[model samples]
Target: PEEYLPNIFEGKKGVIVDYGCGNGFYCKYLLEFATKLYCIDINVIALKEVKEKFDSVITLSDPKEIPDNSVDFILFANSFHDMDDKQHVISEVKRILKDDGRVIIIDWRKENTGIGPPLSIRMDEKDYMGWFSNFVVEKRFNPTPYHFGLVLKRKTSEGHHHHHH
Candidate 1:
């Protein structure tokens, strides 16, 4: 299920945050690369379970609890569709991510794949590109038959803004 992650996560001992992490399904994989892992979820019970299962994981109920520009990577796995306030989460992501940090989002494709969320709630590729406008697409791939993955990095001024001569 996590085959697409190694290209970005292998052998990197950096701090990673699993945003909306539910019971740490991806935390185990992330732990292999992360020196420090922060698992954020609105469910306290789920967070507690994650903490109990993973000794190194730090659990939080909110993203604002993280310090600014300190995270090396942020991951959202099949959870962004469940967020009630995506704009708020995006702002927090912008605040917490390092200048060169990356964000990886793996979620259900906006198709009736029969194994994932409903099409109404699932986000299209265009939706992500539009929403994370401050970031540029570093890579795009299919994580699974039902899911799509995107690797994104914060856009530098030189990368996005070039004046016409």
Candidate 2:
């Protein structure tokens, strides 16, 4: 959190979307950096807990609820692979994200980790970059022993191909 996204919250203010936020743990850490923190998850129970925990955050069932070009950063904290609609999630992330905004992804490593899902289901940097064809990989590194992190930025274009208008 400190190394990869060190400068994101340094006195700057904007919206931060915790896409696929499970228990809203990451959202808690991200609150200081963002003026508005959006905690999104498909689970109704999880969203309820998040709403209860953080009064300032707006918990939602879908990322589409967030208006386009309103988010400064979007984070998929070890929850990207768990999503059923990977392509649509990526497209929505791109759509809602600001032009200069960043998408931070942290997921399980390819190797066998005592925790997390199996290697077959776990996604790697290549998988994410491949799905996000229009986006560019800003940085890739191992943030933890069991996880790898990828920071991405949208390509400078008129619009993205994956987005369905």
Candidate 3:
């Protein structure tokens, strides 16, 4: 908790979306800071479990259900690496994230971590930056020895041009 929350939440309170949240493991910590919490996962069973555990949490199986530019923060905690369609996920993230909103990504490091996913799919810091080219890295740190953490916000210029009618 102390390792990541301070940087991720930054003491701000607003709508937070826990992308790929499974069984609401991280939702407890998020609830402390979030005014409204949205948990999104592909598994309906897991979503149901989250709803049961956190009665106030809003669970969704698809990102499309969320309105555009409504979310203040989006968290991808060790789940982005397992996603099958990263491009589609990014597009949805861009659509839902507010202009000043930030994304917090915590994923396995591209190293031989005996506990984490295979190195073949684990993305290095550079790879993540490449995928979010329009966003600037606000901060970077090692949340754990096996994982890397990044806080990213859309570049000022990119944010301005994204409001298309």
Candidate 4:
């Protein structure tokens, strides 16, 4: 977790969200640097367990429950691909983020033949680019095998894309 998640959110503060947190294991590992940890998932059991581990763990069953733009940093480690409402999730994420907030996307390479998902579901840089802008590619070389990491930032104070009134 250190080499991947930490590298993006390195010295930042505020809130750290693990979308589809899945019991918040990453939150537990990242608690040292995060001022507040938020675990977002649809699974009641998983959110329950995550809540037990961290005081800031928030389970927003409905994305609307969270204000448009209140989150700071969001991380998706091989979790976003399964989301049925990817646009909604990404919209809520972009809304809640600070102007300087970042979203880190990491996944096992499509070419990897390791003990992960089937060959088809894997994601690489192009997939991430479709969902984000202002990206920086990180060629991960640690943890025995290499992975692709994308760091996306909202650089303008406006934070969100203009919504027609």
Candidate 5:
């Protein structure tokens, strides 16, 4: 898992929000470079563990409390497919993301052959593409040797303001 992550952000002073961040295990992995790491999840015990590991642990209910356009990167690890309302989350993400911020989604590919979500629950390219059209798909990575990676760049502040739907 470590090898696939880009090394360019090795020492960047940035804020990263891990949605549905569980157990804070991955946060430990990402903390090596993230200036500040925020872990958001629904589990209380997980939140406690996250708090123990990082100073910024945001419970799922108050994600909007972070303020708008403040984050640098948003990472979703096997969690997007679980979100009940994609639009709301996306809106909040866009609002809180820096002009040049990005969201990296690392989820299981729908092959039905591997151990992953049930075929019905699995999300395909079309689902993600339509849901995240507001943001540009900078990369659609099929890391066969690894997991599928989807990187999206949220609209810049200027772009969001002037570019109407």
Candidate 6:
């Protein structure tokens, strides 16, 4: 997974939120680039473990604790569909995200992956589009056969803002 995201975080520094970040495994990489990295998860044990591993990181269990329009990016890595109250979660995501912020979602493929959840429960790209119409899908990439990744931004009356990558 490290090699798969080459140079994705470089040359810039801002706030980054890893929603549902388990054990804070991505902290090492995120800290290297971001000025402030937020490792957030609902599990108490998860944030506890994160505090043990990385002292500099700000770990939180509730997404609502994050300040609105402050975060530069929010990453829902491989853990979106399993969440309850999808609308509430997405609303919080949009609320916290800055005007120019982006939300990157990488989740299990609906097809059989042999390691992930069953297809009946898993959501595909189309499902995400339908639920998250307020956000524009800027880019789609297959990080692996088991997962689908999307870079999205908020849609406004003027249009969606495209990041220069």
Whole-model lDDT values for every prediction: 0.84, 0.81, 0.85, 0.67, 0.71, 0.78
Candidate 1 minimal-lDDT segment of 10 residues: 156-165
Query: What is the C-alpha lDDT profile of model 1 across 11-113, one tens digit per residue?
Result: 5669899999874789888888887899999988899898788877888889877888789999999888788688999988888888878999888888788
After the best TM-score superposition of candidate 2, give how far the Cα of residue 160 lies from its true spot, in angstroms.
9.5
lDDT by residue (tens digit), candidate 3, 1-165: 566787667767899999999747789989988888999999888898888789998888878888888899999888887776889999998999888899998889888979867789889779898888879889888888888889999887833365532
Model 6 lDDT tens row, 1-165: 565444355445689988888746566867766778888777888888889888988888668878877888788887777776789888788788888888888888887778867788888888988878888998787878788888888887575544222
Predicted candidate 2 versus true structure: per-residue lDDT over 52-152, tens digit per residue: 88899998888878887788888889888878798788778878887778888888888888787888888888888888787888777777788888778
RMSD per candidate (Å) reads 4.4, 2.7, 1.9, 3.4, 3.3, 4.1
- Estimate the TM-score of every prediction: 0.90, 0.88, 0.91, 0.80, 0.82, 0.86
lDDT: which is higher, 1 or 4? 1
> Stretches of candidate 5 above 4 Å error?
55-60, 142-146, 155-165
CA displacement after TM-score superposition, residue 17 of candidate 4 (Å): 1.2
Residue-level lDDT tens digits of model 4 in 1-165: 665555555667677777777636577666776666666777888878867666665666545655555667778877887776877776777677766667877677778567877768777778777766544454333332646666676545456557222
Highest-TM-score candidate: 3
Residue-wise C-alpha lDDT for candidate 5, range 4-77, written one tens digit per residue: 55543554558888887864657867777676677777666878877766775455543767767778888888
Error of 5 at 121 (Å): 0.9
Candidate 6, run of 10 with poorest lDDT: 156-165
| Clashing residue pair totals per candidate (backbone < 3 A) | 0, 0, 0, 4, 2, 0
Candidate 1 segments exceeding 4 Å error? 158-165
- CA displacement after TM-score superposition, residue 62 of candidate 2 (Å): 0.4
TM-score quality measure for candidate 6 = 0.86
Ranking by lDDT: 3, 1, 2, 6, 5, 4
Clash pairs for candidate 1: none
